[PDB]
Amino acid sequence: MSDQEAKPSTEDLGDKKEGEYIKLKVIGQDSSEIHFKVKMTTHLKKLKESYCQRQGVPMNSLRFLFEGQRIADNHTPKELGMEEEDVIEVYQEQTGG
């Protein structure tokens, strides 16, 4: 009942398309965690920044692994096969400074 108007959606490459955001959570060896909202398709590097920016801890000293998956600032939520309320594990180990 929000809007009963007919959307055109005539032409689009996938940018004018409707997209929803999902929220996830990641925990590190620091016993800390962060909750973020990302898109179905996007780069997880944004959450890395937000982690270092919010917790003030160096995202380089540790890495982001999803149940054994390696996420090096390029992997996407769509590629990992995951969804909202998902958990990522941050292990402490140099990932190449």
Strand order in the sheet with 87-92: 33-39, 21-28, 87-92, 62-66, 69-71
- The experimental method, as deposited, was NMR
- Looking at residue 7, the DSSP 8-state letter turns out to be P
Q: What is the 3-state secondary structure (H, E, C) of 60-92?
A: CCEEEEECCEEECCCCCCCCCCCCCCCEEEEEE
**Token code pair at residue 34:** 């962060």
- The letter for the amino acid at 88 is I
CA nearest neighbour of 24 among 77, 73, 68: 77
* Domain residue spans of the chain: 1-97
**39 CA to centre of own chain:** 8
Closest Cα partner for 44 from 31, 57, 59?
59
Distance of alpha carbon 57 from alpha carbon 49, whole angstroms? 10
Candidates 17, 29, 31, 25; CA nearest to 50 is: 25
- Which sign does the torsion angle of CA 65, 79, 21, 38 carry? positive
